[PDB]
């Protein structure tokens, strides 16, 4: 089918907690929360405005600090919706307005509700052939278990995802057959893992910094195939990578203050194809 198609994207608002309030690894600098605000407002700006992509956009919970990364919350394959149970506590609350917006949206809905299953949506790599779900802190081998059940059309691979917080945290799907992937240690074992659980062959956009290996590729009609990336500006090793492919419609998209909250790009919508 046509890999990357979409019509509708879900996305959530910043609430102020998140801030200071939101989980993070590494404690740097600090959230500068107006400049996050409009890094959001630019990203969704692009998906709607510029791509044509109809917006739906889920208001913030002040109680929920994370709530703007609807990606671990669903993951979408098709008509159907599967409503994760993150693997962090205090995201589980997430799942309500999310799954509202779907139901909303007609999809076909299944819920994560086993109390010993965990995913996290940032934990899965759809390639457009099969997925790969990493097993992190966030994701365990139950909650990949009822993906793999959901999904039931597609192959389901799990690998290893170490010394980072999600699969995703250092890949992502730069074309219909080609995975962008980081330069690390443990990027590279990660990649060499899902090439080796797959009897087709992908291609590799490799970049020297991991969270720059996350990006968002969408085929849209009357623009063809588009890749969202990081900035020159925030990493401009990896950008010279990107910009070599002139064979996809560019556009740098800024994300420097959610991604001090562990947020990468993918990380903040929810792609539906109707």
Request: charged share 25%; net charge negative.
């Amino acid at each position: 089918a046509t890999f990357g198609r979409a019509t509708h994207v879900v996305v959530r608002a910043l609430p102020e907690s998140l801030a200071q309030q939101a989980l993070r690894r590494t404690k740097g600098d600090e959230v500068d929360f107006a400049r996050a605000e409009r890094q959001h407002q630019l990203y969704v700006g692009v998906l709607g405005s510029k791509l044509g992509l109809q917006v739906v956009q889920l208001p913030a919970d002040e109680s929920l600090p994370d709530c703007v990364f609807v990606e671990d919350v669903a993951v979408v394959c098709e008509e159907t919706a599967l409503i994760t149970r993150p693997g962090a506590p205090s995201r589980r609350k997430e799942a309500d307005m999310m799954k509202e917006a779907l139901e909303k949206l007609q999809l076909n809905i299944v819920e994560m509700k086993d109390e010993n299953a965990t995913l996290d949506g940032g934990d899965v790599l759809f390639t457009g052939r099969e997925f790969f779900v990493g097993l992190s802190k966030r994701t365990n081998q139950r909650g990949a278990e009822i993906l793999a059940d959901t999904f039931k059309d597609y192959a389901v691979s799990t690998v290893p995802v170490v010394d980072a917080l999600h699969l995703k945290s250092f890949c992502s799907m730069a074309g219909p057959n080609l995975i962008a992937i980081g330069s690390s240690e443990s990027a590279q074992k990660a990649l060499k893992i899902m090439q080796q659980m797959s009897d087709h062959r992908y291609d590799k956009l490799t970049v020297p910094d991991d969270t720059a290996a996350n990006c968002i590729y969408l085929n849209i009609p009357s623009k063809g195939h588009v890749l969202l990336h990081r900035t020159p500006e925030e990493y401009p090793e990896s950008a010279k990578v990107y910009e070599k492919l002139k064979d996809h419609m560019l556009i740098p998209v800024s994300n420097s203050e959610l991604e001090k909250v562990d947020g990468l790009l993918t990380c903040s919508s929810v792609l539906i194809n109707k």
